Each structure stands twice: as structure tokens, then as C-alpha cells.
Amino acid sequence: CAKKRNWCGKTEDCCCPMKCVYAWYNEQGSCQSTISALWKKC
């Protein structure tokens, strides 16, 4: 699992509700609690 502010990439997954998200100039993305994560409340 990964924590918030953690660069995303290959298979790994984050710690709900944290989900791989995208930034801007860094497609790397980062694990951040997404609103849709509510439907899957960790």
C-alpha cells in the first residue's frame, strides 16, 4: 500500500480512501483521498 502524497505508477494501489490521482506537470500522480472514494469508504 501507499500513503498520501506518494507518487503513483505501476500496480501497487494506495490506502483507501487514498486513490492514485494526477497532478499536472507530474503524471506520476499521487495517492489522495478521492471524492468517489466515499462510495468505497475505506
Q: SS3 of 31, please?
A: strand
Task: Record the cell numbers describing residue 22, joined without a space.
Answer: 494526477
The two counts, helices (H) then strands (E), for the chain are 0, 2
Way it was determined: NMR
Residues in the chain, how many?
42
Name the nearest CA neighbour of 14 among 1, 5, 4.
1
Q: What is the CATH number of domain 1-42?
A: 4.10.40.10
Domain positions in the chain are 1-42
**Cα(23)–Cα(12) distance, integer angstroms:** 18
**Exposure of 3 in the CB half-sphere (CA atoms within 13 A):** 0
Task: Record the cell numbers describing residue 34, joined without a space.
Answer: 478521492
